[model samples]
Target: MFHGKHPGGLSERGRALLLEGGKALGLDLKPHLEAFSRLYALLQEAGEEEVVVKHFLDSLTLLRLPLWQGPLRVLDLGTGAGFPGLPLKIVRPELELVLVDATRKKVAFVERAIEVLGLKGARALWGRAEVLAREAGHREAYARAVARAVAPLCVLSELLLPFLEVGGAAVAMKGPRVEEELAPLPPALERLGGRLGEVLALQLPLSGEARHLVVLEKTAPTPPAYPRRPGVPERHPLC
Candidate 1:
């Protein structure tokens, strides 16, 4: 902790993440942190520092990318507790966020956090991405998609790519396991009308946790058959 005042009783590392990530992202993350603390005890077993480092700051790393600019519609697939989506929305208010999760409870917490944080253009939906992608308004309606601690690059590309418009990209947040998965990650992406883009390696401050933002570029339109119904992609991964 860099000796900052936490008026709302945030932990030291939570304060550190709020200050440091805020400075880097050019937005004060205090409101977001306060909102999360008030909403629910998300990741309570992980401890406050773990939440700040692994969840909050890890999500902040996406802001380092140039693609997080304004006026873009972004999707946060499988956004448990609104990891990257809520943080991203807090920093970049101009970007519209659609945070999705399979669990109704997580989505409930996320929706509350969105309101408590006074975030605009951000919505949390409880549903399977596979089912939502084929809907009229949901299909190819986003400029970008992101997921954290969701699934392998192979499965994520299948789950997330369908929500993105052509020329958009999906950022899959992975850990050290990605190195092995990288070899087999490309095929599923290509098969789903997306191409393997850059794998951005990042290190969280203090904890030094490894994070890889595997970006998959949507080069072409995803076929109608894609996503293949709920549970299929995860059950039988293409890769």
Candidate 2:
């Protein structure tokens, strides 16, 4: 859609936007960005501008909204290549991060990513979001949960809501036209101890890429019945 820059509007202004964001958001992300650029194999969506604008800077947008600051427990579900989760931890080192992906190899890469980035208070785990949500250590544990382009809000609410403690929120990074998927979610959210919150719509600063963060706040402990079962969340999605 952008004619001024490269094909996707990420080449020139993409990385440039990231650098500017690094300054605005706090911390130099280029070194870390450069470090992870080579490991795009761990990510399904891979490219220079894509990695910068799509993955890195896009993930950082969570900070654009209000998040509990200082040592908050954050969970990143289906985090391929440790997105929003990793970049988030990179900027807010005070955050205690658990980056989850189903693939062991991807988890391994995230493990390595933290070490390479010299990031502390973070660890990578390989498990399905459904399964992980049931684990005592993970269920109702985190103050903040986030995912990027992982699933529709219906599916994401189930996978992400169960992990949140009351008053905490699950932030799903979505795209445009999210209203349809959100329509049927209220009933499911009620059963899951989550209440629908704001859906913040914004664009990537550089490419003007559309993004939305669907916020679900946990008001009570999720019933033990949810996440339904492994893979069911995707199939049924509680809608």
Candidate 3:
């Protein structure tokens, strides 16, 4: 029966992963086990086991950050399936969350999930992260920004860090091999008015794969050239 909380909704691996993940992340997820089960049920038809454990729960580790206890605003960039952000919000109701993505269908799924989960102070925005960041009521207003597997460090930092208030942070979920990517991009990140704050190694709840959370701090204001003309960052990241 789905660990006495999650029902036929979870695969054996999925259930095991959730329990292990809770332990590893030092989070008491028993209260929200049913909620995660519900999320899996939504994606049960075609969800990857690794993603359910590593990508989803691992990203939510940001909730453990020091500033999480207070009422804070969060921006999740290109939030496909709303990993990290949605799960974080579900567990910690104090956060004001804005989920941003360019895809309407994904945003629709997020909307439905938010309704089903009965989350308040949460909404999904269907648009580019950069555009939304520049609009009124959004610029430099977020306490934290996060994106999972969205883009390379150079591009992802640009897309999400613009929303962070000075001294705020953008935590990027990255693969274990993040060093290779970071080595060549230090200058690019500095030029964008950000600096690598911390790179913490994380172990997923159930899976044994090594993942890294690259925390970038907004040390200074982003240059006006960023979020560059729509498709430009994707085609020519730091160039």
Candidate 4:
């Protein structure tokens, strides 16, 4: 449920707008106070303990939404249940969101969620990041890429940076003790045509646990061989 306040809480009008938009999209948040119970249940069934609201807030917080200007296109890699992507779409309606996951069930859920929400400029797809990033229509086409998927920083860099255009960014969410991951990222970024930009530290409102958003900016096009078939990046991380 939607509990803690954002940097500055949403305005009365903003709240109304979210409700109206959700209604238009066929999503009703009234039954679930601060969050969606079904989403929480889904995650719980998947053996996740953290609940969906925290994931939603974490996604929103890491993004620092006010600073981004759109009509921008965003790629949410491995978007399990569409945390950042879906919530981001609810707030920033102008964004063109693409949610990708390799799992059929997860992707199907996201697709249904998008359709039920009547979301515009958004789509959900089932595909691996490695394969999709090499496609003519998808490769290097987005302004931003985001992932909360748990992979080493090097592998994440390899997975995400290729989806962004030059001057675009990839925001990877990580837990505390992220420095160990950061240490191995430079070489990966080099190989992927990206540069490490910033490490933004944040605290979960209710839990007070540490979270970090690692920003990587794309400086050049990705190399031809990258992402490396399907499971190769995970097996042979660039670090």
Best-fitting candidate, scored by TM-score:
3
TM-score of 4: 0.80
Error of 2 at 234 (Å): 1.7
Ranking of all candidate structures by their lDDT, best first: 2, 1, 3, 4
lDDT measured at residue 174 in model 3 versus the true structure, 0 to 100: 81
TM-score of each: 0.87, 0.84, 0.89, 0.80
Q: Write the per-residue lDDT of candidate 2 for residues 1-239, one digit (tens) a residue.
A: 33345432334454566677656645476765554343333343334555545567777788778784899999999887788788788778799999999999889889987886677899999999888888899999999999987888888898899999999998988887888999899998999999999989988755677878888999998888898888888887688
lDDT (CA) per prediction: 0.78, 0.79, 0.78, 0.74
- lDDT by residue for model 4 (1-239), tens: 34433333343333444454344334454533233333443345441323345565566664452334679899989898886788777667788999999999989888877765567898999999999989978899999988886588888899999899999988888888787889877977988899999888877644578888889999999999887988898998898
Stretches of candidate 3 exceeding 4 Å from the true structure: 1-8, 11-16, 45-54
Off by over 4 Å in 1: 1-8, 11-13, 21-50
Question: 1-239, model 3: which lDDT tens digit per residue?
Answer: 44343344666667667777776778777777667777777766434655766655776677556657767898888888787788888878898999988999888888888887788988998998767767757778898888888888888877877788888888888876887778877788787888888888866556567778889898888877776767777888882
Q: List the residue pairs that clash in candidate 2.
A: none
Query: Model 3: how far is 132 from its true place, Å?
Result: 1.8
Quote model 3's TM-score. Answer: 0.89
* Model 2: residues with Cα > 4 Å off, grouped in runs: 1-15, 21-51
Prediction 2 global C-alpha lDDT: 0.79
Model 3, C-alpha of 86: deviation from truth (Å): 1.0
Per-residue lDDT over 139-239 for candidate 1, one digit per residue giving the tens place of the 0 to 100 score: 99999999988877777788988998999988888886577788987777778899988888877654666778888899998988898888898899998
Ranking of all predicted structures according to TM-score, beginning with the best and ending with the worst: 3, 1, 2, 4
